[PDB]
Every structure is written in structure tokens, then in C-alpha cells.
Amino acid sequence: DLMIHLQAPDLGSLNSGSLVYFRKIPVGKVYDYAINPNKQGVVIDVLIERRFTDLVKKGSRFWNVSGVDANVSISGAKVKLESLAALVNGAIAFDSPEESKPAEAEDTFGLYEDLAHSQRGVIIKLELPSGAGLTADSTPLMYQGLEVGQLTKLDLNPGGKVTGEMTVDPSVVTLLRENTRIELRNPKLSLSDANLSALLTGKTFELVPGDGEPRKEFVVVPGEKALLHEPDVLTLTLTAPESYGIDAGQPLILHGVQVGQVIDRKLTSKGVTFTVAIEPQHRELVKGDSKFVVNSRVDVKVGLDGVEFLGASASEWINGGIRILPGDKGEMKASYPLYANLEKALENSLS
Amino acid sequence: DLMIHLQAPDLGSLNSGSLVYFRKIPVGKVYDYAINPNKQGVVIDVLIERRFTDLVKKGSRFWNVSGVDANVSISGAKVKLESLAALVNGAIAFDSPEESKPAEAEDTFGLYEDLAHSQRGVIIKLELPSGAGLTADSTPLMYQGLEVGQLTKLDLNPGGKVTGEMTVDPSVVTLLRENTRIELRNPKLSLSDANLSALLTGKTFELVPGDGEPRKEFVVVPGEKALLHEPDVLTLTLTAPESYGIDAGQPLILHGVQVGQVIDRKLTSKGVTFTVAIEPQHRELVKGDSKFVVNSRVDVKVGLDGVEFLGASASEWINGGIRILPGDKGEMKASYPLYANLEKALENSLS
Amino acid sequence: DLMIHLQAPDLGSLNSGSLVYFRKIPVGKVYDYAINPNKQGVVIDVLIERRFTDLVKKGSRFWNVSGVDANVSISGAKVKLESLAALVNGAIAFDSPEESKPAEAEDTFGLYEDLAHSQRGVIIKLELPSGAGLTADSTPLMYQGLEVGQLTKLDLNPGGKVTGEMTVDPSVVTLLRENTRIELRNPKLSLSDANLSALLTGKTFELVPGDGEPRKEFVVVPGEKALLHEPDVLTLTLTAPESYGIDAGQPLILHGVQVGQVIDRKLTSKGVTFTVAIEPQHRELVKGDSKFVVNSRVDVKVGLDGVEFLGASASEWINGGIRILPGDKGEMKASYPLYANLEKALENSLS
């Protein structure tokens, strides 16, 4: 027989004589339990049967299957009663890996509290902005619309620094590399596709891959700020004497299509300084010379022969933002001015 | 063996012979129970086993784990059946701290009714405005989006004075100091981020830290009023002959960006007197001389050569509030006038 | 031993041999039960133990704890299974007050059906308008946002007169006095604070205190009418030849701020007579002379040099109501006219 030790933070629903499973086959039983010298944890020593000993490995993980847990899920709640024997007495299930040395001679093991906590994978440290919609064991990592990871830990370090960590699977671990971003998605209001599922899930970690050296720790930034930290991005600080009603997250439009986004708005004594960003595809297309025109205000001129509507359209007005007048050749200077309307941008009159 | 006394307000689901746990290990049993001379409470005396005696400390807390409690939670309701033995007979669990003297010789203990009531921490007294959305054991203290505290008590003192108290954890207790504000957040309607969780939680205590001497009692004010009690803030009483449709909580705008907020509106016999406030960052930027223009009313002038739209924009009109015309140098006088539109503010004609 | 009688409207889940609790300690048992000579009620006589006899008092209340009751509550439903012994056989719990004579010699007692029905307090009779959203045991009395009372009875007397009664706690009983109003609140639609709790609760009795002799019966009026019955209030009957689109509950505005409310609109053969009311603070401020101008209609005049927008603003138009032009000195006469717009009020031309 095999006499191995398990280290648990508490005994749980396990009694002496409760049963140990492999593939839901009883292959042993719990022999004894005792508090170790430190008050922190309970050591539970179990006894595998003589013929089953080979099953346990050095790289085995043991988990606890005891009691009935009921889950309420969106789009229907499937409550299934799998194992009746675990209710009365409790149980411990375990996995056997492919290639590992067989365990022997009172080898210790951590006892995970669930099958989901005993999933293999790689710990990935995150430096989160806030834990506003994040949950300790309930926030997933999406990639291509599929659940790849799970936020497994969320702490508030002193100094006001929210940090967490995440278990990601191996196939994605190969994907993880330098300049690979993890940004949090808000459950944004969708008008074209009416889905309750996105609203119910809440915050959602999105993975966008990159190339370079493999890294195992990332920094998460807010969705508005997320654009700034792209591998390729163009960051322009543009000045203006007034905000002109341009908020921090307005879209930024060239030739009718959104090519960039305003990132943030800072008020100074000289005026309002914006910091806008630009995507890689259109980085070539700006070409270092441009004019910047406000689309947040409407302008109507009435006349007997001259009738004109300037600087906005109703869809553009509700969207708002900054319009680009692209030029032919330039040096991509640091500061640009923000013109009040189009004709003052053609006149080059910022006053 | 150890023979200690527990003081409970009622017996609960505990019978004689019910079981006492440490880390869910049975380490004793309930020996007897009797009403003490005052009718108020029940004294339950228990018996720890001889070898387990060392586990009990002077700083131990005992709590009650008996019966089945089912919780319905937003985004899914996880009902887990942990302990079967507590249903039939009842149980008492207890904690052992790190450094305390061992208890002996019929030492009394308070019996908490739950694990959540037996959490360690520091009582923080609050002087609340009202208990409109507050709950006795269900209102949390957020800090950086994480649950830090729990409103544990809510009373209505005579004179119409709602006061409560709160258990906060030690790491935050270090943070708590003079000029550290606790303000209540309303579940405000969010258009950009659609989250059901904020609406379901309701009122929410937000912690914003400050520096100075550590204090252990605070005064909570309503969210609109909360701005006024900041460590650094500028409070201007500005007069006007009419409200001009400016409500008590309108935003207050310099150069297009909100720099302050109107706090409250008082009607007098001379007119309408507002009291507006100003954030620390823009306190330097006002510089003691300014003009104050209403943004709540639209003004259209039609003409053959003169066409103009004055004092408002559609987003500004729905937002409303007061616009600042900043000056160069002044003394930051007490009273300011509120001009009806911009050209009367340039003409300095308040009539 | 003590042999006392209980009078219940029916036996309930109580059997002979069911158990009697004090602080959930078994201190007796049910001895027998028999129908009394009138068919109305069942007399249940119980037997307290010899040493426990002192516990029962003249001012004791006995209540019934039998069966399992499950409650579904908003923001989560906490179903807790407290007492297992009451399910099979039934139970009776009781309270012992602080200062009362001990009961003896077959003293009768009413048996309340629940712990909530056995709460101490003072019966307060209410003369309700209707029971449209009221519930027999589920409508609370709020004071400062806290639950103070509970509507315990709701009857329809002949003649179409809905009357109910309410148990209020002692501390508030000290507050209850002459000119202290109890008005019912509707779950009004709130745009600034999104709370599901207010909508789910429904109708809600609000307590506003006053001074004078203590009274124990009140008259509840509808929320619109409630203003009229204030301790200090100004009631003006103002005439008009047309309603001008002014509904029964429009706000009434001086200097941009709401100082009063229209109470009701009555159509006569001469015209439309309104009855508006005025709050105590602004009662001094009207000063007996004023003009009354409709804010419910817009007026646009177009001209080459004269452009003007008269009698309304978009927020005022959606709000509607009556505007005051305050005067210097008057006698506070009974009837006032309602002018169609502002310039006819300055011309004093009601035709």
C-alpha cells in the first residue's frame, strides 16, 4: 500500500474513512488527519491500495469533491447531481499525468479545493488599474471569443496598487511573447447585436498577440488608455485654446473613416492640450503634415445665394472628434494646433 | 480538559452534545447551557479535549455554524452544501490567533452568529445623512474597486440622527488618517458601460485617502455636498437676480472642461444666491479674477449679415451650468455676480 | 410547575407534546388543547417547568414557531434553516419583559402567529385614501430612510372608507405629536439615481414630525394633496378663463426655483379655477402682492430688429406651471387672476 500526505488549509467535509477516486473509481481511502505544528494547516494522510500505487505520480494533483454545489448560469441553469457518495462522507479525486516519476514514501501534496483550481497552466501576473468589475475566480481571458484563462487571484498591495494573477493554458503560453497586450473590455451597449450574455458577464480580459521574447508578466491599462500601449502607435500632443466640447475618448476621423482616437484631455493655463493616438495602418498615411479641425460644433451660414453647413454632420456631431486634413510631406513635428473650423484651418489662422 | 464559557444572546440551533470545530476538525463538544441571572443572555459552557487545550487563546473568537443558509447572488447564485453534521445537531467553530496567551479557567467568550460577524478589524463610527439605501450588514466600503469594509451597524438616534459603524481591515487602518473622506456613491445611470452589478448593489461607500493624524470617526455627507468637504477646495458664493434655470448640481465649466460643480442654490429676497465649489488643481488657475456666465439658456440672433448663437451649445445646454471667464490677477473676493450672457459680462452690466 | 392557557384562532402545526422555548431553550411543553364554548377559538394549555416558572410574566407575549417559511427578497434571497425540531412537531417561543409581575394560576395569553406580529409598539389608526398599493402586513413606515413601522391592518369600512392601523416603536412614539404628517410615497421614476429597490417596494409611508399635543390617529391624503395639509401652508384660489394646459400637479416657480405646487384644477362655468399652495419659507417672500403668469405655452415673435421668445423655456415648458411676479406690499387677497403671458400681466390686461 501507499501512505502519502496531503496538506490542506482545513479538513473540509472529509471524514476519516472517506474515499479517494481516480476516474471516479475508488482506489483508496482517507486514513487519518492531524494538525501540523504550525496552526496554519491540516495534514491529511491517505492510503492508496497496493495494486493502484503506480497510478500516483510526482506530478499528480489532488482535489476535493465533497458536498453538492449548485450553479445558476445565464441562458439556463443546469444543476446535475453527479456523485451521491460524496454527500454523506466526502471524497478526494486525483489525476495521473503522462510522464512523471511514481511517488512514494510519504510524499506531500497540496490539496486543491475544486477541479477548477487544480487546472494546469502558467501563472501570469497582472498589474491592474482597478478591481471595479473583476472577480477573484470568475473573470475569464478571452481569445478569439473562447475562454482561455481565468483570473485566479486579486490583491490590493499597499500604496493603492491592485495586482492579480491568471492561469493560462499551454497552447496560448506559446503565443505569449513580448508586445502582446491584455486589455480589459467593458460590457459596452450594443445596438446592432442584442446580446444579454455580454452584459451579464461584465468585464472581460481580451488577449491580442504580439512577437518577440516570451514574457510572463503584463500591465493592464484602461480601455481608453489601451490604444497608447500598442506595439506600433503614433502619439500626437495637439494644443488648442479651448476644449471645443471634445471629450477624452472621441473618435478621430480621416476621410470619413475613424483612423485614431483621442486618448486624454489636459487643461493648462495656456489652454487645452489633447493627446491623440493613431493606428499603425494609417501611420504611413498621415505623412507628417496635417491640419486638425474640430467636428464637435455645428456651423450654419444663411444667405440669399450662399447657404452652407460647416464643420459637422448629425452623425459626426453625435460622434464628435477631430478631422484630419492630410498633407503631402512633413517631418512629423511634436506639437500641432487644433483649428476651430475648416476655413480657419485653410487660412492657417488659429486666432 | 478545558471548561470554558460562551455568552450568546440565544441558544440557537445548538443542542447539548453538539460539536466544536477548529479547521473543521472536531476538537471538543458543547457540555451544558443555562440562562444567566439577567434574562438577557444564555451562557453555554463547552469542553475542549485535553490535548487540544493549547489551541484556545485569550484572543480567540468563537462563531456559530449551524443549519443551512442559501444565498442568491447576482451573475449566478452558488449554493454549496459544505457541512452535513451541522444540520442535525449544530456546531461551533473557532479561530486561533498567532500570538496570544492561552486561555484557561472558565474564561468567557462572546459567541458571534456567523463567520462574517467574527471578522477582525477596527470599528469606524459614521455620521450618516440618511439610511435610504443602506443595509445593516450588507453595505460595503470600496477602495480601488475592492471590498475593504462592511457597514455593520445602523441606528437612528433621537433628534433624527442616523449613525452607523463599520469594520475595516488593518492594512486600510494604516491608510485611515485626518482629511480622509468616506462618501456614499449612488448607483448612477451609466451610458458608456452597461453594468447590472452597480445597479443591483445600490449605495456604495467610497474611500478616498488623505494625510495627517489617524482618526477613527468620520462624517458622511451626500454626494452633491461631498465636494465641499474636500481637504483643499474653493467655495464661492455667487449672487444672481434669477436662478436662470441653474439647478443645485450643475457642472461648472472653464475652457470647455468641467473644473468644478455647483453645490447648492438658495433663494433670498434680493435674488438667487448660488454656492459653487472648485477643485484643487484649478484653484491656482482661477487666479482671483473671473466672470461667471450662465450656460443654461440658448440665445439665437438672426440677421442679414449678423448670425450668431450665444451662451450655449446642445451638449452644454443639456449639461447646463456656469462658465468662467478667467482674469489675470485679483484678490479672490467673497461675492461674485452671475451674468446673464457673455456680452453683458464683457460690458460688466449685471442689470 | 406552571399551567397556563393560550388562546389561538386555530391549533396550527402544534401537536400535544410540542415544545416551548425561551431564547431557543426548551423550558416547557404543550400539555393539551380544546375548543372553547364559542366556536371561534382554540384554547391550548401548556405546562412550564417548576424552576422556569419565574420566567413567565404578566406582560409576556407568546408566538408560534412551526414549519419552514421561505422568503424571496430583492438584491438576494437569504433562506436560512434555523430550527429543525419545529418542523416535525411544532413549537411556541416566548419573551420575558424587564419589569412585570410574574404570571400564575391559569392566566390566559393571546398566541401571535409570528415573531413579527408579536412586536411591541403603539397602534396608530390611519384614514387612508385607497389601498391601491398597500399590503396588509408588508407596507413600512419610513423615517430618515429607516423602517420604523409596519402597516398591520387594512379594512374597507362601509361607505367606501379605507382605514388601516400601524404598529410604531416607542422612540418614534415620543416623536408623534400634533401636526405630524404621514404621507404615502409613490415609487416615482428616478433619472439621476437608478435604484430597483424603490420600484420593487412600491408605496411607502413617510413620516414628517411636528410639535404639539401627542395624538394617536392620523388622516393620510394623496401625495399631490399632501402639501395642502402642512402645518404652515398658503392656499391661493386663482381664476383663469382657460386651463392653458396647466395640469393638477404642475410645479410653481418664483425666480426660477420651485417655491410651491399647483394642488388641483376645477372647471366652472366662468372658467378654470386653480388652487395652488405655497411652502412656509416662501410665504414671507410672496408679501401679498404678485402676478401669475402661465409657463405652459411657448411664444415666438419674429422680426427684422425684434426677436423674442416669451413665456417659456424648454425645461420650463416640459415642467410647465405658474410663474410669480412678486410685488412689494399687499393684503394677501383671496382671489388672483392668471395672466396668459408676461406682457399682459405687466399691462394688467386679463382679457
Swiss-Prot record, chains A, B, C:
GO CC annotations on file: outer membrane-bounded periplasmic space; plasma membrane
Expression triggers: Induced by a defect in lipopolysaccharide molecules.
Effect recorded for residue 314 to N: Loss of activity
Annotated region (MCE/MlaD 4), positions in chain: 232-340
Source organism superkingdom: Bacteria
Subcellular localization(s) per the UniProt record: Cell inner membrane
UniProt-recorded name of the protein: Lipophilic envelope-spanning tunnel protein B
Native organism taxonomy: Bacteria, Pseudomonadati, Pseudomonadota, Gammaproteobacteria, Enterobacterales
Gene transcribed to yield this protein: letB
